[PDB]
């Protein structure tokens, strides 16, 4: 069945200046600007209401695999909106059993130096994705804080740390040590 029309609208706040050049979305907020391109999807992106209040997404004549890409665009634009308003803060905790995991942050918060993960002499060097700040959180013993505007770079950098501190050639249900994403929130709460 070719559904004649699937639409979904996203409400855009007063704090955000949004723009579109075809199927790229340029979201502007207090924390900076996010561009994301969507020419891989073939939708209609309408910017309706003067003062640009609602962003509307249309898919005309789509089967199920094309209808599933409307709400994906709306959720991506929403994640960009919360990226430029409130940011993204991924709080990782460093679980250890016997060997304390020593984390040293270098280059403004763009490189992680992981040492003594399970008593290894090998030092893990994890380079952050561009624009993601990395920081050891105060008032907490073994925690690390990732802050940014792109959720897909913040969460990918968290995944890079997590898959860098992986246990090999043992039982991972007993050898539970590593640095794991514990909280997913924003930089600025609301």
């Amino acid at each position: 069945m070719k559904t004649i029309l699937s639409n979904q609208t996203v409400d855009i706040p007063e704090n955000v200046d949004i723009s579109l050049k075809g199927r790229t979305v340029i979201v502007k907020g207090p924390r900076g600007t996010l561009r994301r391109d969507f020419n891989h999807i073939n939708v209609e992106l309408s910017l309706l209401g003067k003062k640009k209040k609602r962003l509307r997404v249309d898919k005309w004549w789509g089967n199920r695999k094309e209808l599933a890409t409307v709400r994906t665009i709306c959720s991506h634009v929403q994640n960009m909106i919360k990226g430029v308003t409130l940011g993204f803060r991924y709080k990782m905790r460093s679980v250890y059993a016997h060997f304390p995991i020593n984390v040293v942050i270098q280059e403004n918060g763009s490189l992680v130096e992981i040492r003594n993960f399970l008593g290894e002499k090998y030092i893990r060097r994890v380079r952050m994705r561009p624009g993601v700040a990395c920081s050891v959180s105060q008032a907490q013993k073994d925690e690390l804080v990732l802050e940014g505007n792109d959720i897909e770079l913040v969460s990918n950098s968290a995944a890079l740390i997590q898959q860098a501190t992986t246990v090999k050639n043992k039982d991972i249900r007993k050898f539970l040590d590593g640095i794991y994403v514990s909280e997913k929130g924003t930089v600025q709460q609301a």
Partner: protein, 52 residues
């Protein structure tokens, strides 16, 4: 040892999983079908075994 607040966090990504019986894939805990094409997206799933 490890405090249980951190132990639940480690167990969430380490053993709170469902395992395909045909291709041993490590799937999310609410999985009904396996994600891998090699098992034909089968629904023969077991819980991942826990340590004693």
């Amino acid at each position: 040892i490890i405090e249980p607040s951190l132990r639940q966090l480690a167990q969430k990504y380490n053993c709170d999983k469902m395992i395909c019986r045909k291709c041993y894939a490590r799937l999310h805990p609410r999985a009904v079908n396996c994600r891998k094409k090699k098992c034909g997206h089968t629904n023969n799933l077991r819980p991942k075994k826990k340590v004693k």
